Subunit: 121 residues, 2 copies
């Protein structure tokens, strides 16, 4: 397995109205979670959704509002946000600078699949 | 469960020759992994170790050399590093700016414990 993935910012895939770099796939990497580096561009907002899966945001750079079920959480570098199960959430970047965060998501399926793949190896 | 934890840069805990802020404990948060926000201060290196637990680094700010066994990997913001099992790893910051990264680690135990707590 590759040890390092150098970030190529131009390789990001636009989804959920933001620019992302998904962790997976990564050949040889077995994780019980998924992840992505996400950028909400200046004066934009991301796509509102909700889901059964657990999710954590690690705020990397810039400033934004995380709206979770119509409660607003201002955030900046270093802050951690838990996304409650099935809550509607999106990210609002009213500022002039890119807003960066890493999301990690997981559930029973992803965890069991990690354990299953280990046993198969 | 508190939804948000604002970073308190005044409350880092020195460990592994770096200044960190661990994810856990967090009342009400059930995860199959552990985590920490880590700062390697200017002109320092972190504590070299190895372990039978999986780990990855998400590089947040600054520049460093990550040495994994006998191999050097220059890193900067956005880079991701997987720490191979039982590899000796540490971080070298030769620069005048703090080096920030997030580490996520996991293993069979942490994943099973997540499942067990869920079921409870
Ligand atoms: Na920038
Ligand atoms: Ni989500
Ligand atoms: Ni380690």
């Amino acid at each position: 397995m590759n040890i390092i993935r150098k970030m190529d910012w131009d390789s990001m895939v636009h989804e959920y109205d933001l620019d992302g770099s998904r962790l997976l796939p990564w050949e040889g990497l077995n994780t019980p979670f998924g992840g992505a580096w996400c950028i909400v561009r200046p004066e934009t907002k991301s796509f509102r959704h909700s889901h059964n899966e657990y999710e954590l945001f690690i705020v990397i750079q810039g400033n934004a509002i995380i709206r979770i079920n119509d409660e607003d959480f201002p955030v900046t570098k270093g802050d951690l946000i838990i996304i409650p199960l099935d809550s509607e959430h999106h990210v609002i970047n009213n500022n002039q600078e890119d807003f960066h965060f890493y999301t990690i998501w997981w559930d029973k399926e992803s965890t069991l699949n990690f354990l299953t793949r280990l046993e198969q190896d």
